[PDB]
Design a protein around this ligand. Structure first.
Ligand SMILES: C[C@@H](C(=O)SCCNC(=O)CCNC(=O)[C@H](O)C(C)(C)COP(=O)(O)OP(=O)(O)OC[C@H]1O[C@@H](n2cnc3c(N)ncnc32)[C@H](O)[C@@H]1OP(=O)(O)O)S(=O)(=O)O
Ligand SMILES: C[C@@H](C(=O)SCCNC(=O)CCNC(=O)[C@H](O)C(C)(C)COP(=O)(O)OP(=O)(O)OC[C@H]1O[C@@H](n2cnc3c(N)ncnc32)[C@H](O)[C@@H]1OP(=O)(O)O)S(=O)(=O)O
Ligand SMILES: C[C@@H](C(=O)SCCNC(=O)CCNC(=O)[C@H](O)C(C)(C)COP(=O)(O)OP(=O)(O)OC[C@H]1O[C@@H](n2cnc3c(N)ncnc32)[C@H](O)[C@@H]1OP(=O)(O)O)S(=O)(=O)O
Ligand SMILES: C[C@@H](C(=O)SCCNC(=O)CCNC(=O)[C@H](O)C(C)(C)COP(=O)(O)OP(=O)(O)OC[C@H]1O[C@@H](n2cnc3c(N)ncnc32)[C@H](O)[C@@H]1OP(=O)(O)O)S(=O)(=O)O
Ligand SMILES: C[C@@H](C(=O)SCCNC(=O)CCNC(=O)[C@H](O)C(C)(C)COP(=O)(O)OP(=O)(O)OC[C@H]1O[C@@H](n2cnc3c(N)ncnc32)[C@H](O)[C@@H]1OP(=O)(O)O)S(=O)(=O)O
Ligand SMILES: C[C@@H](C(=O)SCCNC(=O)CCNC(=O)[C@H](O)C(C)(C)COP(=O)(O)OP(=O)(O)OC[C@H]1O[C@@H](n2cnc3c(N)ncnc32)[C@H](O)[C@@H]1OP(=O)(O)O)S(=O)(=O)O
Ligand SMILES: [K+]
Ligand SMILES: [K+]
Ligand code: NI
Ligand code: NI
Lengths: 260, 260, 260, 260, 260, 260
């Protein structure tokens, strides 16, 4: 049993359903630790396909990173062992396909999380927002890279620079989503595809997913470039704007950014 | 002049038509050797554009890799000098544009072969399937790479994990195809484009093609990562599942995959 | 303050309008030097977003590289410190979003210039052509790379190999454009998006833009590959065809290309 | 206890001594598994430095790969999970320095093994040979890479192409060894160096060792280059010469290599 | 002129002499700022070669990083804009040769500084230590890479893991130094070589130096690898050991490291 | 037979002896065409090792690139198809070991040529110098890389920045040479080593040589860094100093370089 998720397996498909709606499935450490334990427990030969979903009728799929657990005092908010960074690596390395089945609105880290999964099938009423510029967060290289494998650079830069929600219809048009269906068809459509996948060769699926993962990561740079970017990110998470971003969220007001 | 292809030259355009209908243009060594000889013979200054096609009216453009020529004995089925691996390198290195003009259904290795070409123009009734997970084949890094330059990761993973065929309409929408034409207009439309390209500067075309080839390939990794992937692939082509997939196809039954 | 551009500021948005209509905003050194000076002058904490535009009603957004300023052969026409190469690096390194607001037709180096910008919003009547194969120009690796981050390989190869114009509608479909709007709505639509972006966290925008630039450049190759390409490009700019392409344009006739 | 090694601890220094003299410490699977378990058991905070050694007075430090365990099929003798490949990775990733203390002759895979360690301290009578060209073995990329971080390319090529032994004195002159000492002083010289290291900051040692490991691995290539090398290696392990090399070694005669 | 350096120009050679003897030429910000200003001021066409030196007769060339300016309490001590990180980039990017002419003892960051220079000529009584493991410092990737281009991996690991001084004789034998001379001959030898270099083609020298700099940096890795290393570095600069190393240095006592 | 080389076969070893003493074996196009023809003619199974040599008693092993065949200004002097660039690629890709057996003085491109070979055995009276800074030549990235795999950076920079000859003794100590012998012993010492190598497994030798070549080349950079370097080289081959260097050689006088 898990406190923050509910797992149902039928035949060779496991459905991991979020159970943290009192905090709109915000990516708190306790919630992510349960999701990763549930996935680890499902890493067995008789499980062939995973679905991630919010409960039926959710208005909010996930409110993204828990803003209360973002560090304020000059620590990197997206370091390698941050729970969001851990879950995306775990999904990408997991030797089974993982389908995000989306009903409701997706925000920030949660958008990265579904982008790191293998397929996204969404309700026609679902919406998607990438939010670091609303909070002054210097999103990390790995995290940004996870957002660049589906839609083109211009579309990705519109999403990030505006932080404006896009519809499921537009997310489908630009290459982010596999399918958009009416919400009443969402479970049936997704289960049919997951059950179809689970009849295919799991060892071929596992090595092809791993090859894609390696190819997707194989954008290489020298140590000086990385260290230069890390200096840039530190200046951002050291900024008054980053403090203003978090303060504005806690005070339920609009941030006033000034460029320091 | 070739047993398994028919070549016609119209000014600066060459059309290479498959002549292997008795095996549905399966990528047999003897067929691919003739296709490569024909291309090589056309590597002449006065030829400016190639069209690859199946004969007019074909139900099957190509049934993909010849399953009777796939190694079953714990050997790599997709090594460097396998015919499919040879023809994709030749298409990509060829200093003239190669247009795949598709009528009929496209399967597995033949889908990778058209994806390796420069442009795809397809009949509205054409369909496309990527099939390794039907057979338990550990598709190789270069082969997978060749499928990732048009549609996004989520789309590619849907194609490979489901092995389900997609329509020409969907293949256009996700960026795999350039154009979708009624079958009665396919030949005329493709030849008009091939003649237009043939009026352009062939040395500029060749160097830009080669720049795109080398940029497309420039996802670099260290030796350890490659050797780790090669170890995973060998575990797959040594598996019971790989034997079962080949056997089930030849015996025309549904395979029973067990995860070893 | 500038001979070949007009700059207006509206709150935190700066609009840089071309003023070179006499040469259809061809990318002459004098024009590019003025655009770069205006952009450098606007790198200020009270400026949050830039719009690049041609004057209202323009039939031609930009006719591309000034053909009178291309070297006659034996000289690389797209060397590192060529004005087009300088402006694309400056746009990509600029720590504020740059939106290309396109009315009219876009040609050759001007197409690369808008692709190098962060967002493109276009009139429904605007058209886009990539033209090196009309002139026999061996486009450089960096320049070609700048054309590969929005649309897929097959689409980019059609654009370059045909040099045929595409509509705003098709450029939207294939991922080149962010939005297409009626020309009467273009300025208000673009200004509202720029104003919106101007309220977001500028340091988070600048570091994410830079992360995207670095990830976009991170296709790496060895020195031999680069020098092999440079040798191919030099064979093209040494060619009879290159001189013929230049001569044909100046003499207003169809080039006769022969493959040397 | 271990069947094939003896472990002694002297405060923070652990000495792992081969106990496989019957087979001249040949790198059999059972010997390497014991070595790796002994290392794993020593990965504790109270141990700060590891010495690997043969027993005092050994004429042969290690005879290299067990030739009876080399695949002579059309199978890769140095695949990712072969014991030699496993222990070099484990030595390199081990978060404490590992010092090879060499008395006796070193051969083949045993030479790669001490080269993968952090320091080599040797008796003045010790000798070193790299032997794959005596058997016709296609040594793997990672394995060769492990021989290239100490001596220069001309020296490495002499060692490999001749398979001739070099002295401790020449191995020191070309950068392979840290120190050469008279055999009576070897143990004490090596222990004092390990005790000295063990007084230093272990978390600093571990992260600098890991930084060196990843910089040492960071020679990157594309998938096509790797698969082309793999194809060449397979042609070597499928060769008559490879058979002849193995048979000649076992039958204690000179091989007759013919180049297929 | 400069508070913390003295500059003497002889024909086309400039000799930059350290004038921070109060702190044995420790790399304080005020000293490095004057060193970089003096170097910048010498970037003129009539200057062809630079010598860096301590005053004639110095016991200590440089005592390394200023320990009072190294961050405690969980900031990275070797961030991109730390003085040491700035001076090594500036030395490597300087378009003239920079010769380190060493008299006295060289410590830690000052050893990286001279290794980042083009040639090192040393007195026979000079000595060289690399000290991070004495303090528990997690030396950064760029800094470690700067130590790997002269001696082999085994030698570099001995230097770093022991933090023991080596003699000029040993530094010459392992490839760190160009020449070792008697202290009375140091100025004559160095100036003769610098004057000889100053006769040569300065633009050829500049471009070849920059080629070597780029080739030297061209060990590339993916974002995940870099972020993983950064996480490990943070765990060290967050450690109790790091605090102990700093406190022990300030209190002039032996550190007691415990591995957390 | 060849106009400009003489070939003798001794069992499985082939000796290619320069015959261009009239221009001191300067690497003229026609000399290099014969060297490459002779290597190609010896690429047969019954040849196992190549020796390159000057005739017995030569004072000059090779005077380097033919200065008369360098372009006059405004053209890359070391383009991919230059004969020096061709012969180093051919030596490095040749599937048999190539031993440079050196008697006399070695200059410039000829120093790079022997560095590109597998082993170097030299007379005790032989000397070595790298000369581009004597002439104002912007050496290319591949050519510089070929000089970095034996001696460390400081040594390579001393060699290039001074253009000063070094002795065989010093070339041995820094790792450039394999062996130094008295000139009377040179021929038979080198032949004994070639005959020894010729008894080893040639397919193993070939694949290990190719693995070393690929790993040697695997320092990767992005397109921007390469084009930046090419722009810097072009400024040097466009410079007044490049013309002064070529004219000073032609007029047998000391160049006056001014840094433009
Ligand atoms: C760092 C990355 C992140 O993921 S940061 C998190 C980004 N997420 C967001 O910006 C969405 C924030 N929340 C919202 O926009 C709205 O709460 C949400 C999604 C639209 C639904 O509105 P609603 O009216 O239905 O519910 P409420 O407005 O009352 O919010 C319910 C209570 O939960 C709170 N809440 C919401 N989201 C988060 C969150 N991500 N972390 C922490 N708390 C959150 C919200 O403040 C409200 O708090 P209380 O009023 O105290 O009960 S980054 O930005 O991508 O870089
Ligand atoms: C390794 C990669 C591969 O490409 S393996 C091959 C993947 N290809 C496929 O899965 C397509 C399998 N074939 C089919 O589904 C059906 O033949 C297809 C294509 C829908 C056509 O339907 P159909 O009912 O008309 O089929 P037929 O009557 O021709 O069936 C038997 C005759 O056609 C021939 N044929 C067909 N496909 C192949 C093939 N892939 N390899 C070798 N032969 C093939 C088959 O040999 C037989 O010819 P006969 O000798 O006259 O009986 S991978 O999968 O991408 O990893
Ligand atoms: C090298 C890279 C480049 O960008 S080379 C340039 C590529 N650009 C093109 O191919 C577009 C060439 N021009 C056109 O397609 C048409 O000129 C244009 C845009 C469509 C509209 O035709 P139009 O009938 O309204 O006007 P005209 O043709 O008669 O010429 C009008 C005045 O502007 C001038 N003009 C035009 N194009 C260029 C150009 N690329 N460079 C320099 N000047 C140009 C033309 O000479 C004439 O000026 P005046 O005679 O002084 O009034 S590459 O090709 O990408 O590699
Ligand atoms: C494949 C990679 C490998 O490492 S293959 C192994 C390379 N190792 C060698 O070439 C060393 C082979 N052995 C020798 O040269 C001599 O045995 C050596 C080590 C000098 C010891 O001389 P010795 O006179 O005291 O002892 P003997 O020669 O009379 O042999 C004692 C018995 O042990 C055996 N032996 C030796 N080496 C190995 C080995 N590597 N794997 C398996 N068995 C080995 C040797 O064949 C002899 O066997 P029997 O007399 O039949 O019991 S690679 O080459 O690096 O690619
Ligand atoms: C973080 C990197 C670093 O470079 S950390 C620093 C590594 N450097 C060292 O370990 C050398 C530290 N210094 C010494 O051991 C001794 O000063 C040395 C060099 C042996 C000479 O001893 P001495 O008796 O002749 O002279 P003193 O000790 O009295 O010092 C003279 C004045 O200069 C000061 N000084 C010295 N070194 C440093 C330093 N690294 N940072 C800051 N200040 C330093 C020293 O405190 C003394 O100042 P006063 O006490 O005010 O006269 S890392 O380790 O490479 O990672
Ligand atoms: C550009 C790349 C190159 O490789 S360019 C070539 C670099 N090589 C050199 O700098 C060596 C230049 N030559 C010399 O230093 C001397 O000729 C040398 C080799 C020490 C031999 O002196 P010597 O007095 O015995 O013979 P001479 O001076 O009288 O010359 C004999 C005739 O051949 C000529 N010669 C010499 N070297 C070259 C050369 N590299 N290319 C073309 N011609 C050369 C020399 O000019 C003389 O010609 P004549 O006076 O006309 O008979 S780079 O520099 O590496 O970047
Ligand atoms: K809006
Ligand atoms: K300053
Ligand atoms: Ni990419
Ligand atoms: Ni390297």
């Amino acid at each position: 049993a898990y406190q923050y998720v509910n797992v149902v397996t039928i035949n060779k498909v496991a459905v991991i359903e979020f159970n943290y709606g009192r905090k709109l499935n915000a990516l708190s450490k306790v919630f992510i630790d349960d999701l990763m334990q549930a996935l680890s427990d499902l890493n067995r030969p008789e499980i062939r396909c995973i679905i991630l979903r919010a409960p039926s009728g959710s208005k909010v799929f996930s409110a993204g990173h828990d803003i209360h657990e973002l560090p304020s005092g000059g620590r990197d908010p997206l370091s390698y062992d941050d729970p969001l960074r851990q879950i995306t690596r775990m999904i990408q390395k997991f030797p089974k396909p993982i389908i995000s089945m989306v009903e409701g609105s997706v925000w920030g880290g949660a958008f990265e999380m579904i982008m790191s999964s293998d397929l996204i099938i969404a309700a026609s009423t679902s919406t998607f927002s990438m939010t670091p510029v609303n909070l002054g967060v210097p999103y990390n290289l790995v995290g940004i890279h996870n957002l660049t494998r589906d839609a083109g650079f211009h579309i990705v830069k519109e999403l990030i620079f505006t932080a404006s929600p896009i519809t499921a219809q537009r997310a489908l048009a630009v290459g982010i989503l596999n399918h958009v269906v009416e919400v009443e068809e969402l479970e049936d459509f997704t289960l049919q595809m997951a059950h179809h996948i689970s009849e295919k060769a799991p060892l071929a699926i596992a090595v092809i997913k791993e090859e894609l993962r390696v190819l997707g990561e194989a954008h290489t740079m020298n140590s000086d470039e990385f260290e230069r970017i890390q200096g840039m990110r530190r200046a951002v998470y050291d900024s008054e704007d980053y403090q203003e971003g978090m303060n504005a969220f806690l005070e339920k007001r609009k941030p006033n950014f000034v460029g320091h």
